[PDB]
Amino acid sequence: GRVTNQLQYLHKVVMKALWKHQFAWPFRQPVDAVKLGLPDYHKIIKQPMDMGTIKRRLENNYYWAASECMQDFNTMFTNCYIYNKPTDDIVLMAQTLEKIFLQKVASMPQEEQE
Numbered sequence: 001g002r003v004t005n006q007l008q009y010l011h012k013v014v015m016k017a018l019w020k021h022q023f024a025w026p027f028r029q030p031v032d033a034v035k036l037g038l039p040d041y042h043k044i045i046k047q048p049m050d051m052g053t054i055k056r057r058l059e060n061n062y063y064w065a066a067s068e069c070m071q072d073f074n075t076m077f078t079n080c081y082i083y084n085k086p087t088d089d090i091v092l093m094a095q096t097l098e099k100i101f102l103q104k105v106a107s108m109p110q111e112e113q114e
């Protein structure tokens with residue numbers, strides 16, 4: 001429970017841009033193993049993560065520090081590289097989204113205030 005200048009930057013700057021990105025749609029909500037037909041998804045991915053959950057957590061002061069939030073973004077991206085075949089379009093979409101993420105994090109203000 002906490003609001004800091006970094007967490008605010010992750011919510012209003014970084015996540016805002018990632019969210020409406022043209023390749024964001026598969027990431028805005030939890031992966032639906034049933035709907036998408038991957039009955040083995042949850043046997044391989046033990047810690048599912050998606051942008052909806054991350055956004056909600058930033059809106060409820062769930063995070064104590066920005067690093068905990070960055071870790072969730074990383075898990076979401078990593079889940080995708082681990083589970084899918086190397087050639088899937090989804091892998092390309094996650095790498096594209098992750099580069100934005102890393103680029104924005106590099107400019108995250110360092111004052112870790114509040």
Ligand SMILES: Cn1c(=S)n(CCSc2nc3ccccc3[nH]2)c2ccccc21
Pocket residue numbers: 025026027031036079080083084088089090
């Ligand atoms: C296979 N595949 C699926 S399903 N979707 C849409 C459902 S959202 C989603 N997030 C994932 C994160 C990791 C793995 C599968 C994931 N599926 C795709 C969209 C575009 C291209 C390929 C796709």
